[PDB]
Every structure is written in structure tokens, then in C-alpha cells.
């Protein structure tokens, strides 16, 4: 009975509504990062933990986009027990202590989501809320992460109720992304206007240009340098330890094996 | 320009086929997107992405992990080079005398040196039928020269 | 015991670095779809392409009959359709 | 690009309220904006 009452009051209740998915995902990103960094049976363990962080993040996205408090309850319960049971499978550590710690933060923010509820407006990219410079840089960085952009799109499509196909979902995502980047730039130009016909600031030019040139230098010259440096190192003294002179004389029985060694 | 008209035609055909199939089998206005269709395509894409990052790592580790082929000294050649001028004392043995230590034998050695952690470690870490017995022959007959 | 090298290059960094490089380049390959899908919605979202396939098939018909003067003329239509996006909208209208 | 982000955000709003009929309709606007470059010029005018 009591357990049923607890669960009823964790589902039906009368609480508020917060969106702490951003922070939950950030906790899981930190977790992923430290497990990736913590490659140090061990490779197999770290590879299983990789697949795990990933799978759990995907399930979390599902429950967030489907606004399931009951689903989040179930996931939390399972995950708590499973991660705590993985402490018993230590057989393949500061890295693991930190992984536990950051996963504890994820469990705390997840527990908050369940006990608060899911807010009506869940859609909308976190880094496209304001149109400043920080939002711009963060968004572009998210787009630079190998597969985050595409994963987000496909995943969201699968959960969110749409009439459009993946092709068309990706179209509206691309349009929005580009439009946001343009908006941020437009906003910053309104905030900090540049006089009409004001060169381009010698220093700015020198910086960007210099970096590009140096990057190009490191495409051609640097590899050559590294290559030559490593290959050049050659030469380890090799001296005959012994002087074995066998003066094989007799055709039938070769002898005369008087010879010497290192002392001589 | 030949390639231009070929590209245009190819694209136009693909569009036409899609238009025709939508006329043949129309999709109601505002009818979700069918949960199953989504789950299928999305799932495949995710799995393909999994196989870009995780699968190579798995394969790599699997192959590389396999390591360890027993290597035991076939013979125990103890040449006690004594005489500076003429080094001799070559009484030594071979495989018949050499005894690949069994599991029980290994336990014995490990327990003998159990007090010293690293001593036992050496023995225990080396796999059974690894530690070989140096039963070097001591008898002579070979006079010296 | 002996240890057979089942790596080839270097498990620690050689193969590792190669793996990273592959992932990145596959990254760009996959981006190649979901980045500029919106720069073609003018050549790929045409409502009715029937009038354009007629043009294309007329070029083919005029090459079989070897009246290559009209090949040049019908090619001119094709390139102007694809040089002015507004005329594509007109020509690809669903009904008329 | 203010008028285009409004369109994009309206598609998002209409998917949260699950009125997916209007999703199809607002998607039609998006694709025509990007199918005719001249209408983009009109819609993206600085002032009006």
C-alpha cells in the first residue's frame, strides 16, 4: 500500500514544472567525456561503458520528447540500481569516482524532473534562446561536434509527432540553424555597429590571416619535419661479442677451433 | 552540356516517380508519420552511427587482445665458463630432464615464496605449465682441454 | 609466454589516430546531407515535373531523328528554366 | 531574417500543440520562400 501511495503521489501529485533536461544532458556529456578520457579487459569495459552512456542518453531524449513522467520514473529506478550494481563489476579509481559523482548529479536532476513534472513548452534548442555572441559560439560548436547535430535531428523526429518525413524535418532544421546564425550576427551588428568605411582593423586582419597561413604551413611543412625528425634517428653500436675463428682444415673432420670471447 | 541534360532528366524522373506514387497512394492530410516507419528509419540511422564509432573499437580490441603463447626453455644449457683461457664446465641438460611444471607444482613454488609478495607474484602470474624446471646435468665424463 | 602482435601499426596511437581521422571524415560525409539540404529545395521540391520531362524527352527524340538544330533550341529552353527560378515555379505549377 | 525565424518557430509551436494540420501548411510557406529567391528578397527586407 505505502509504495503505491508514493508512486501515485509521484505521478498524479500537484507540483510545478521545470525543464532540467539541458542540465541532465550536460551531466551525461561530462560523464561521456571522462569515460572516453578514461580508456585506462579495461578497453572492453570502457567500450561497454561508452555504449551505455550513449544508450542511456538516447532513452533520456525519448522520455523528454514524449514527456513521460512514468517513463522517467522507471528509467531512474532501473538506472540507479544498475549503475550501483556496476560498482560491483569493478573487475575489468579516480576516474570511476568522478563518473559516479557526475552520474549522481544526473540522478539528482532527473529525480527533480520526475517530482516536478514536464513543462508544456519542451521544444526549442537551448542555445537558440537568446541572440548574443555566446549563444552564437556555443551553437556553432555544437554543430562542429562530429555527429551531435544529425543525431539530434533524427532522434527528435522519431519521438516528436510530425507529419513530415526525415528529409523534410531535416530541411526545417537546416533552415532554422542557418537563420539563427544570421540573426545572431545581425543582432550583434545592431548592438555594436561598425562605422561606414572603416578599413577592417589591421590587427584583426593580421590575426586571422596569420592563423590561416600557419595552418597551411602545418599542412605541408610540419608533416615533413616530423617525418624527418623521427626517421633520422639511426645508429646503435653493434660489436662482435666473440671472435669465433674456426679454421676448418681437415676436409673430413674440420677442426682448429681455437677462438676467443669478450674478455679478449 | 550533355551531362547537364542527363542530370536534369535523372532528377526529374525521380521526382516524377515520387509524384506518381503519391497520386496512386495518397496520404491523408495531417496523419502523423506512422510510428513504425519512424522507428525503422531512425533506428537504422542510429545503428549505422553506432557502427561508425563503437564497432571499429570493438573489432580492434577483440583482435588485439588475443595474446599469450607458452614459451618454455627446451634445454637448460649451463656452460659454467671457468678457465679464462679455455672456458669449460659445459655439463648441461635438455628436454627430457627439463620438467614443465604442472599446476600442482606451480602451487608449490608459489606457496614457497608466498610471504614475499613480488616473489609469489612472479610465479603466480606466469601461467601453469609455464615455469619450467632447470634440471641441469652435473655429471662430467667430458674431460677438459 | 610470447606475445603475438595482432595490431600491425600501433594499438596505442597509430591505429587510434587513424580511427579518429576516419570518424571525422565520415563526420563530414554525413554532414554533406544535413547541411545544405535547403539550397536545393528549388530544384527538388517541384510540384509537377511533367512539363520538364516533356522538354527532356523532346531533346532525346530530336537526337534520334538527327534534327540537331532543334537540339540546340530545346537545350536553350532547358537552361533558361534552370536559370530563372521564378519560371520554374510557373512551369511546375500543379494544375496549370 | 526575423520573419523567417517566426515561420520556423511557428512550425515548432504547432508541433507542441499537436495541431499537425497547420504544420503541413506552414511547411508549405517555408518551402516556397526557399523556392523563389525573389520572394526571399521581399520577405527579408530590412525595414518592411
Amino acid at each position: 500500500p505505502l509504495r503505491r501511495f508514493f508512486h501515485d503521489i509521484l505521478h498524479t501529485k500537484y507540483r510545478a514544472a521545470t525543464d532540467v533536461y539541458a542540465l541532465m544532458f550536460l551531466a551525461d556529456v561530462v560523464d561521456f567525456i571522462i569515460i572516453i578520457f578514461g580508456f585506462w579487459q579495461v578497453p572492453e569495459a570502457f567500450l561497454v561503458m561508452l555504449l551505455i552512456q550513449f544508450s542511456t542518453m538516447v532513452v533520456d531524449r525519448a522520455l523528454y520528447l514524449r514527456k513521460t513522467v512514468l517513463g522517467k520514473l522507471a528509467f531512474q529506478v532501473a538506472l540507479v540500481l544498475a549503475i550501483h550494481l556496476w560498482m560491483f563489476f569493478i573487475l575489468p579509481n579516480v576516474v570511476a569516482q568522478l563518473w559516479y559523482f557526475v552520474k549522481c548529479i544526473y540522478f539528482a536532476l532527473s529525480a527533480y524532473q520526475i517530482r516536478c513534472g514536464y513543462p508544456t513548452r519542451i521544444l526549442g534548442n537551448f542555445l537558440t534562446k537568446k541572440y548574443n555572441h555566446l549563444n552564437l559560439f556555443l551553437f556553432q560548436g555544437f554543430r562542429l561536434v562530429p555527429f551531435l547535430v544529425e543525431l539530434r535531428a533524427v532522434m527528435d523526429w522519431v519521438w516528436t509527432d510530425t507529419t513530415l518525413s526525415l528529409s523534410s524535418w531535416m530541411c526545417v532544421e537546416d533552415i532554422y540553424a542557418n537563420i539563427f546564425i544570421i540573426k545572431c550576427s545581425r543582432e550583434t551588428e545592431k548592438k555594436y555597429p561598425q562605422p561606414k568605411g572603416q578599413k577592417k582593423k589591421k590587427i584583426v586582419k593580421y590575426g586571422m590571416g596569420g592563423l590561416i597561413i600557419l595552418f597551411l604551413i602545418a599542412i605541408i611543412w610540419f608533416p615533413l619535419l616530423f617525418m624527418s625528425l623521427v626517421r633520422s634517428v639511426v645508429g646503435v653500436v653493434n660489436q662482435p661479442i666473440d671472435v669465433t675463428v674456426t679454421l676448418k682444415l681437415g676436409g673430413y673432420e674440420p677442426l682448429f677451433t681455437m677462438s676467443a670471447q669478450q674478455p679478449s | 552540356s550533355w551531362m547537364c541534360v542527363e542530370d536534369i532528366y535523372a532528377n526529374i524522373f525521380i521526382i516524377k516517380c515520387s509524384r506518381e506514387t503519391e497520386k496512386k497512394y495518397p496520404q491523408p492530410k495531417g496523419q502523423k508519420k506512422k510510428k513504425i516507419v519512424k522507428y525503422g528509419m531512425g533506428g537504422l540511422i542510429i545503428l549505422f552511427l553506432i557502427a561508425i564509432i563503437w564497432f571499429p573499437l570493438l573489432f580492434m580490441s577483440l583482435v588485439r587482445s588475443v595474446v599469450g603463447v607458452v614459451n618454455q626453455p627446451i634445454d637448460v644449457t649451463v656452460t659454467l665458463k671457468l678457465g679464462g683461457y679455455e672456458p669449460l664446465f659445459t655439463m648441461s641438460a635438455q628436454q627430457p630432464s627439463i620438467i614443465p611444471f604442472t599446476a600442482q607444482a606451480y602451487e608449490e613454488l608459489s606457496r614457497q615464496f608466498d610471504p614475499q609478495p613480488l616473489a609469489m607474484q612472479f610465479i603466480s602470474q606466469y601461467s601453469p605449465e609455464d615455469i619450467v624446471t632447470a634440471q641441469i646435468e652435473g655429471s662430467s665424463g667430458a674431460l677438459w682441454r | 609466454k610470447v606475445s603475438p602482435p595482432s595490431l600491425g601499426f600501433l594499438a596505442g596511437y597509430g591505429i587510434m589516430g587513424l580511427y579518429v581521422s576516419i570518424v571525422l571524415v565520415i563526420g563530414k560525409f554525413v554532414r554533406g546531407f544535413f547541411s545544405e539540404i535547403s539550397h536545393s529545395i528549388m530544384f527538388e521540391e517541384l510540384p509537377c515535373v511533367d512539363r520538364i520531362l516533356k522538354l527532356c524527352q523532346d531533346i532525346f527524340l530530336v537526337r534520334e531523328t538527327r534534327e540537331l538544330e532543334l537540339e540546340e533550341e530545346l537545350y536553350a529552353k532547358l537552361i533558361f528554366l534552370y536559370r530563372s527560378p521564378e519560371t520554374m515555379i510557373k512551369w511546375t505549377r500543379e494544375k496549370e | 531574417v526575423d520573419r523567417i525565424l517566426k515561420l520556423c518557430q511557428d512550425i515548432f509551436l504547432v508541433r507542441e500543440t499537436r495541431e499537425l494540420e497547420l504544420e503541413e501548411e506552414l511547411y508549405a510557406k517555408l518551402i516556397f520562400l526557399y523556392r523563389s529567391p525573389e520572394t526571399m528578397i521581399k520577405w527579408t527586407r530590412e525595414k518592411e
Binding site: - | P28, K29, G30 | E94 | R3, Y27, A28, L33
Partner: peptide, 20 residues
């Protein structure tokens, strides 16, 4: 149908009819 309704866009939608 979905197809016809996503391919129905015309210039009249983008006229400036009190777009606030």
C-alpha cells in the same frame, strides 16, 4: 492529402497583409 498540401505554397501567402 499531405503531398498536395505541402506543395500548395504560392506568392499570396507572402503578401504583407498586416503581418505582426
Amino acid at each position: 492529402d499531405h503531398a498536395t498540401v505541402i506543395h500548395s505554397g504560392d506568392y499570396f501567402l507572402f503578401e504583407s497583409d498586416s503581418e505582426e
